[PDB]
């Protein structure tokens, strides 16, 4: 709990002040805990940092295992997942810690390891996509991997670098894109 | 020179360290000069930035010109682009910088002039290329800015989020995605 705790602090304090302002030593004032107790439990802020999108990333897991039933087919959990990862960022608190994070250890292999898996998590949802769509002759495809990883990465492009027109646009670009994707597999 | 050590040291730092990580001073500290002198074309950090970014999608465009030539159907024009972008040295490292400088300046307005101007430069390869493949017939697009959109982000996407794996495998990637994009076009 006192290591629940200073995930639910951290997380805050990051929520409100991006990754590179805050300091470990407000997240144990804040938190009662200790440097001791932090270390412990985390051994670096970038490690601490890490948990909590690993966390983050469960409850994503899990408003997908929810929402996903408003899809039907897999060519329709397609559309809805991209949909989804595309609105929920425009509002993602953490977003700016994340990008903050990610831009500062992409060079490091040491904090680039941890941050593999994580996003492999997130592809994870896709394979499954794809490979579902496979045993229902939605499309065949070779391998599902491949798509897997292009899908995960050309969706966040889509919803990085549009940033500048009206929420409504970006979905119907964003459904295009997916439209346009779907087709060109078959 | 001066002004030109600038946008030297200046890009130098934007790319390796983060658009935040990077100040005015560590630029005069390292481009021995004075902290004055930025005003006449750099009214602040974001137009000394815009302005860099300006330069390097020009530097790209060039690399562009004198290359797309090996590429002669323009569905090859596609996938050399895509291809090359994964590959160059130009503006595509900067990607970082700004993603992190679109969570923060992208309410002032004064900026998004020098902005979307070169969100222009983004597009144009691909409008150009899906354009002249309306005429030749290689396939039909009515709405050839959307889909030029979707493309470039697309795109952006894979260099962006893959920037840290085998480039063998980026290559391959990119090119399994440019053959699904234009093969879902008609
Ligand atoms: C809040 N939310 C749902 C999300 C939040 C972030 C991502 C991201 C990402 C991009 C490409 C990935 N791939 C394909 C390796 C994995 C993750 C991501 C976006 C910007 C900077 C770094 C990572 C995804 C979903």
Redesign the interface.
């Known amino acids: 709990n006192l290591k629940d705790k200073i995930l639910g602090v951290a997380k805050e304090l990051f929520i409100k002040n991006g990754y ?1 302002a805050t300091t470990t030593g407000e997240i144990v004032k804040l938190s009662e805990s200790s440097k001791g107790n932090l270390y412990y439990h985390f051994k670096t802020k970038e490690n601490l940092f890490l948990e909590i999108l690993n966390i983050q990333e469960s409850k994503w897991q899990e408003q997908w295992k929810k929402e996903q039933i408003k899809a039907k087919t897999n060519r329709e959990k397609f559309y809805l997942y991209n949909e989804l990862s595309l609105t929920t960022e425009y509002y993602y608190p953490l ?2 810690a994340i ?2 994070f ?3 250890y ?1 060079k490091t ?1 040491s904090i ?1 390891e941890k941050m593999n898996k994580l ?1 492999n998590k997130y592809i994870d949802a896709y394979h499954v996509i794809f490979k579902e769509g496979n045993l229902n002759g939605e499309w065949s495809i070779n391998d599902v991997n ?2 897997s ?2 899908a995960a ?12 027109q009206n929420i409504n646009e970006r979905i ?2 964003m459904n ?2 997916s ?7 078959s």
């Open positions: 590179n977003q700016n990008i903050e990610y831009t500062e992409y292999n680039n996003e491949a798509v990883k292009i990465n050309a969706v966040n492009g889509i919803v990085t670098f549009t940033h500048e119907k670009l295009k894109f439209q346009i994707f779907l087709n060109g597999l």
